[PDB]
């Protein structure tokens, strides 16, 4: 059963590090992508994609663009892009951790 | 992409 790519984010949280919480899916899996502020991101150990361990009967995946130890400089605009072959998405949040 | 991730995450790719 193919279907197109879907995201959604939500508030940024603090939960020991921080957390911009999201979920994805799509069929075929699909390619992400995050943008800084319209900048395409580069993750480093201070900001990286976490998932969480998939459901066996699903194609839904959650995660967090997550930060250990965020500084002034990650204040700023967060866009999540999701893409397959039968669908192409963006969503995008503000988040202020300091 | 994804610095945990270099082979994807189940077919999730960066």
Same mark, same amino acid.
């Given at each position: /059963?193919?279907?197109?790519?879907?995201?959604?984010?939500?508030?940024?949280?603090?939960?020991?590090?921080?957390?911009?919480?999201?979920?994805?899916?799509?069929?075929?899996?699909?390619?992400?992508?995050?943008?800084? *502020?319209?900048? /395409?991101?580069?993750?480093?150990?201070?900001?990286?994609?976490?998932?969480?361990?998939?459901?066996? *009967?699903?194609?839904?995946?959650?995660?967090?663009?997550?930060? *250990?130890?965020?500084?002034? /400089?990650?204040?700023?605009?967060?866009?999540?892009?999701?893409? *397959?072959?039968?669908?192409?998405?963006?969503?995008?949040?503000?988040?202020?951790?300091? | 992409? &994804? &610095?945990?991730?270099?082979?994807? &995450?189940?077919?999730?790719?960066?």
């Amino acid at each position: /059963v193919s279907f197109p790519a879907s995201v959604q984010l939500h508030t940024a949280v603090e939960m020991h590090h921080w957390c911009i919480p999201f979920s994805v899916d799509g069929q075929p899996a699909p390619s992400l992508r995050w943008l800084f *502020n319209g900048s /395409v991101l580069n993750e480093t150990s201070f900001i990286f994609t976490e998932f969480l361990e998939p459901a066996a *009967n699903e194609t839904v995946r959650h995660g967090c663009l997550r930060l *250990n130890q965020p500084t002034h /400089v990650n204040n700023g605009n967060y866009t999540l892009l999701a893409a *397959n072959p039968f669908g192409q998405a963006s969503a995008s949040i503000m988040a202020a951790f300091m | 992409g &994804f &610095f945990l991730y270099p082979h994807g &995450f189940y077919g999730i790719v960066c």
